[PDB]
Design a protein around this ligand. Structure first.
Ligand SMILES: [Ca+2]
Length: 416
């Protein structure tokens, strides 16, 4: 059958739970589309971006070529001027809220309100809603999505495959003087944002900041102008998700699973499986987890100290997380302290299981206990123990075979 007819294997990750994930595989021939631009994409998804989220009709959408979501209704590229509120001016915003004169007071006033409206206009245009029972599949080796992202909100049964996503740029990042000690700029757009949705399969896609690395975005208020956000974020009670054979490269914050320490509504959810993904020269959240039983296996993480993106940490152990990591392979071209690979964000002794981890450093290649490594050099301890046993997987490859396999098969254009 067609590529759009392919569905998630019976035991391939949490997304296989119950009836599994079939996306728009059962779509009628009249509901199989080929799109080449923003308008055609929104039309194939329903005809109206906002209400498209309620379109649960089985549908297959093939993405051919490059689709820039940062375009007007005539599909012509637009710049910040197109979105800019009449009461907003970047320079004026810089002068008004610089930490050196505004301090750490809550950002407010006409300029901020104007920034919010400008941001909303871009958001309403570049974040494409995806309805239930949808399969968005890239054609060939050059299917690309840029300037925007997919919003998988309050829907179920969605498949996204074979597409190269260039992370969307937020033209009106919010300045938060209290984010950290020095404050930080924060953006809203992700290439794929999964919110309150279940049974989602993200497979063989490539995520990159591409032609717009953070390094080229500049600095304001003495802080990097972070116009990017997540590559693939999962939050607000989303559940049963499988992230496989994807490439995540040249990006800062990759994958968030659970966005709040206090959202108890996430408890019992956020069950995600991530396997055979290629993380190359990314900074953090690979992934960062809160509440979920997240299965992480056969992933290849590769970092070079020459990369534009520094490395902070890979596995974020958040509140009530239940990470179960198996046979992941890490490669660094510098003698990094392996205790830095795991980072914990909690007030309690969290539990996680980890086994078969290999670290490949200039001083040697070997199996390593990352949890033990973390504990030896940190304060708050992490307990290595089995609290649950992953059942949704067909095969777990031996760790030394991971690099060759992932490098060869992960990412857009590497199927068939
Ligand atoms: Ca996000």
């Amino acid at each position: 059958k067609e590529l759009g007819h392919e569905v998630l294997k019976p035991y391939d990750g949490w997304a296989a739970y119950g009836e599994g994930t079939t996306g728009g595989a059962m779509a009628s021939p009249q509901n199989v589309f080929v799109v080449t631009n923003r308008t055609e994409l929104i039309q194939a998804l329903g005809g109206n971006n906002h209400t498209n989220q309620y379109n649960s009709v089985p549908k297959i959408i093939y993405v051919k070529g490059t689709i820039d979501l940062n375009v007007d209704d005539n599909n012509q590229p637009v710049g910040p001027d197109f979105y800019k509120d009449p009461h907003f001016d970047f320079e004026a915003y810089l002068r008004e809220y610089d930490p050196a004169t505004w301090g750490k007071k809550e950002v407010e006033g006409p300029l901020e309100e104007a920034r919010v409206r400008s941001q909303k206009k871009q958001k309403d245009r570049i974040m494409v809603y995806v309805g239930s029972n949808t399969s968005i599949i890239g054609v060939g080796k050059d299917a690309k999505i840029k300037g925007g992202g997919f919003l998988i909100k309050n829907v179920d049964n969605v498949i996204i495959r074979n597409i190269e996503f260039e992370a969307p740029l937020d033209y009106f990042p919010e300045w938060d003087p209290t984010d950290g000690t020095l404050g930080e700029w924060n953006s809203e757009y992700d290439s794929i944002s999964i919110e309150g949705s279940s049974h989602i399969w993200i497979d063989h896609n490539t995520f990159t900041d591409g032609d717009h690395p953070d390094r080229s975005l500049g600095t304001y208020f003495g802080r990097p102008f972070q116009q990017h956000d997540g590559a693939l974020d999962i939050k607000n009670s989303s559940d049963f998700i499988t992230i496989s054979y994807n490439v995540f490269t040249n990006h800062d914050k990759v994958t968030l699973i659970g966005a709040s320490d206090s959202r108890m509504a996430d408890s019992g959810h956020l069950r995600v499986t991530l396997h055979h993904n290629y993380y190359k020269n990314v900074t953090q959240r690979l992934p960062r987890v809160r509440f979920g039983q997240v299965h992480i296996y056969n992933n290849y993480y590769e970092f070079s100290n020459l990369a534009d993106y520094d490395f902070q940490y890979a596995w974020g152990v958040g509140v009530f997380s239940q990470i179960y990591a198996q046979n992941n392979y890490f490669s660094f071209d510098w003698d990094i302290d392996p205790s830095l690979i795991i980072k914990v964000w909690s007030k309690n002794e969290e539990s996680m299981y980890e086994t078969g981890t290999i670290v490949d450093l200039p001083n040697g290649r070997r199996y390593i206990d990352l949890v033990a490594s973390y504990n030896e050099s940190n304060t708050l301890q992490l307990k290595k123990e089995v609290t649950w046993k992953p059942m949704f997987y067909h095969v777990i490859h031996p760790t030394p075979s991971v690099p060759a396999l992932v490098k060869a098969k992960a990412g857009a254009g590497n199927l068939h």
